[PDB]
Each structure stands twice: as structure tokens, then as C-alpha cells.
């Protein structure tokens, strides 16, 4: 086969981090060459074993999940850190293998007249379990006064947008972070390079 990296990496519409898209990929072949030959990517790091080594060292079942975050908060995306995106939005595990691929899409996402399509979760009553999204947009009650679904006092709305325009500085530019995560099982290496 071929693995849909032209359908993931050249995709037209990434969701936000409160409802990030996840694509289980297996039973195809890896095009890991042009990943490095792309070289238009801001923050491109890997784990497990070296990025030059991963061309052939291949995988049972990969999880390709992607979202869009801010140009400042992307350092929060690292396996085992803190900050809002890794606290309540999307959680890398304690022991992780995959690569974090990060670049700017300022010419697409941030629009004049304002981009407010994108969102994120700013609060939750616990830190987030690893790789589990949170689409539950109910009201959290920080203080003890029960708001019970409607908004009110001591309680806030869960979600918030980002503010994207091309009037933003370089630190406030939207990154289309796609994260590749890997594993190994009794299952064979169903996705494997040349």
C-alpha cells in the first residue's frame, strides 16, 4: 500500500485541541524520506531511537493525531511537561515513542477580520489522562456554588478561542502540530518502510 501522509500532512482542515482528530494507521508503507526532505517545519523532534534510524525500524500500529495550537505554547507539547495544552487539552504519556511534528500555517489559519474558529479547554477539575480528549463542554464549578449546566458565579465556561490574525507577532502564529505515536505488540509490523 501507501500510508496517507499526503492525506494527513497536506490535509486541509485540522480541528482544535479540545476535539483533536486521531487516525489509526496500519497496513501500509512509510514514506519517511520526504519527512526530512520537507524542511519547511519549525519544530520537528523525535524519540524512541534516532530519526535517521527510524526509516527502517518499523511499527505495528501507529496513531496519527493532529491539532492546531499557538506558537508560544508548543514547548508545552513535550512528553512530560506542564502548561495548559498538556494540562487540560492533550496529554503526552509518561513513556512516549513518537515524533512531534510542528510547523506554522500562518498563511492559512490566521485570517483578516479575525480567526476564531479554533478553540481549547482552559479548565477541568483534574489533570488530563494521556491521549484522552475532552469534548465535554459542560460547566465546571470552581467554587462550591452549584451552577448546574448554565453559567453563573464561581463557575466559568470551559472552552475559549484563540485570537488569530496575521497582525499577530511570530510568537503568536498558529502551528499545525501533528503528533505521530508508535507501539509494538504481538501483532506484526503492519506498517513498515522499505
Amino acid at each position, epitope marked *: 500500500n501507501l500510508c496517507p501522509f499526503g492525506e494527513v500532512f497536506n490535509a486541509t482542515r485540522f480541528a482544535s485541541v479540545y476535539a483533536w482528530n486521531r487516525k489509526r494507521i496500519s497496513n501500509c508503507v512509510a514514506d519517511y524520506s520526504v519527512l526530512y526532505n520537507s524542511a519547511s517545519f519549525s519544530t520537528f523532534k523525535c524519540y524512541g531511537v534516532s530519526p535517521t534510524k527510524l526509516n527502517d525500524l518499523c511499527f505495528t500500529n501507529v496513531y496519527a493525531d493532529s491539532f492546531v495550537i499557538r506558537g508560544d505554547e508548543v514547548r508545552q507539547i513535550a512528553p512530560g511537561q506542564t502548561g495548559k495544552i498538556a494540562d487540560y487539552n492533550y496529554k503526552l504519556p509518561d513513556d512516549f515513542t513518537g515524533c512531534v511534528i510542528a510547523w506554522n500555517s500562518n498563511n492559512l489559519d490566521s485570517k483578516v477580520g479575525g480567526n476564531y474558529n479554533y478553540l481549547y479547554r482552559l479548565f477541568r477539575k483534574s489533570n488530563l489522562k494521556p491521549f484522552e480528549r475532552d469534548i465535554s463542554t459542560e460547566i465546571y464549578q470552581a467554587g462550591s456554588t452549584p451552577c448546574n449546566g448554565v*453559567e453563573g*458565579f464561581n463557575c466559568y465556561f470551559p472552552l*475559549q478561542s484563540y485570537g488569530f490574525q496575521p497582525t499577530n507577532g511570530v510568537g503568536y502564529q498558529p502551528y499545525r502540530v501533528v503528533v505521530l505515536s508508535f507501539e509494538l505488540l504481538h501483532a506484526p509490523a503492519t506498517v513498515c518502510g522499505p
Partner: antibody, heavy 118, light 108 residues
């Protein structure tokens, strides 16, 4: 982005009239939604909430007429039936949203006239 | 009981380039949960300030909010010929929500 309302009209008192208001651009589903009232020359008076993210319905006890509120979430639409009418409720209604320190989602319908008269 | 609002003054006929302070007072101590609206009569209420201290898209800093607790302030500055309309404050502290009676800024 946009809110549309069911048709207003002249209804005799004591009757009922279901109020439909459909959303567009972004869903009703993730948010709450409200109804408010404007009588001519009178201030904007809040009426009732809806809270889809759990399920709960709060009404103003100032006008406590069991004006029932529920959803059609899959059409991004909301239904409040005008029950136990009385003539001073003759006004225009709006579909509403409140920026509760977090969002900026205050979007308002076009406004339709409910009339309570024989 | 309910939470009473006190919007003062309920009208103020004004002139070009003014700096009008439309006050919305509260019966209780509300943290910042108060808003402001533009309504020319027959329009939709265009939100002006959220959480009583924060501006809004499309609305420049000719409007400017501040206050907390009971006392809330609409700081209209450099009063523009389009800004003459009927305005409103707003609680979101408890249920029920009430709105102010309105303040019509109008040409002298």
C-alpha cells in the same frame, strides 16, 4: 454566525405558541442559549435559559408562566412554547447568548413580535 | 430574592466628542459579571464590554469599562456621531439575569 426565528403573530390570551429559533455558522450544541423580551419603549428583560451541556431549564419568576424550553440540537434550533398568555407580554423576543467572562459569543436573532390580544 | 440593578442616569442627551460615564450600580457584590450593549431602537443588542473590564472586536477604545463589586462604569470617550443610541448593562452573576433599564445617549 446567524440566528433565525419562528413567525410572530397575534394570538388570543390563555393560548400557546411554540417558538422556534435555528442557528447557523456555529452550532447551538456546545453552548447554552437564552430568550429575552423587549416591549416597545421598555428595557430588555431576560426570560429563560436553556443548558444543553447537561440538561436544565431556568425561567424568570417575574414572568413565571411555564414557558417551556427545550431543543432540537441536531437542527441547531430551540423551542420555547408560549404558555399561559397575558397581554402585557405583547413584545418582540430575541434569541440570546451571554459572554460569561470566557467567550465572546453574544449573538442575537432578528426579533419577532408575539402579540397577546383578542 | 432577586438581584436589583441600578443604571444611572437612565438617559443623557449629549454632544459631539463627550466623555460620558454611564453608571450601572448593583444591589449585591458582583465580581465582574457585567456587560454593555449597543442598541439603536430596532436593532440587535451589539455587545460592547465583557466582564466589565475588557474591550470587544469591532469596538475601539472609545468605550472603556471598569468597576467591580457593586459599582460598574461605562466609560464612553470621544463621543462619536454613531454612538448616540440606547445602551444597556447586564449581570450574569446569578439566576435570574436582569438587564439595566437602558441609557439613551442622544444628540443635544
Amino acid at each position: 454566525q446567524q440566528l433565525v426565528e419562528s413567525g410572530g403573530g397575534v394570538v388570543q390570551p390563555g393560548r400557546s405558541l411554540r417558538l422556534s429559533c435555528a442557528a447557523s455558522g456555529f452550532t447551538f450544541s456546545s453552548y447554552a442559549m437564552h430568550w429575552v423580551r423587549q416591549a416597545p419603549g421598555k428595557g430588555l428583560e431576560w426570560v429563560a435559559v436553556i443548558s444543553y451541556d447537561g440538561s436544565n431549564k431556568y425561567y424568570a419568576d417575574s414572568v413565571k408562566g411555564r414557558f417551556t424550553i427545550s431543543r432540537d440540537n441536531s437542527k441547531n434550533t430551540l423551542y420555547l412554547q408560549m404558555n399561559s398568555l397575558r397581554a402585557e407580554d405583547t413584545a418582540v423576543y430575541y434569541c440570546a447568548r451571554h459572554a460569561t467572562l470566557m467567550n465572546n459569543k453574544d449573538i442575537w436573532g432578528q426579533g419577532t413580535l408575539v402579540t397577546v390580544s383578542s | 430574592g432577586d438581584i436589583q440593578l441600578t443604571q444611572s442616569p437612565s438617559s443623557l442627551s449629549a454632544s459631539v466628542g463627550d466623555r460620558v460615564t454611564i453608571t450601572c450600580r448593583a444591589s449585591q457584590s458582583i465580581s465582574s459579571y457585567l456587560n454593555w450593549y449597543q442598541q439603536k431602537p430596532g436593532k440587535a443588542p451589539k455587545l460592547l464590554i465583557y466582564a466589565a473590564s475588557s474591550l470587544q472586536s469591532g469596538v475601539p477604545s472609545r468605550f472603556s469599562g471598569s468597576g467591580s463589586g457593586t459599582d460598574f462604569t461605562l466609560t464612553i470617550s470621544s463621543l462619536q456621531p454613531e454612538d448616540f443610541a440606547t445602551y444597556y448593562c447586564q449581570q450574569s452573576y446569578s439566576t435570574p439575569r436582569t438587564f439595566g433599564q437602558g441609557t439613551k445617549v442622544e444628540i443635544k
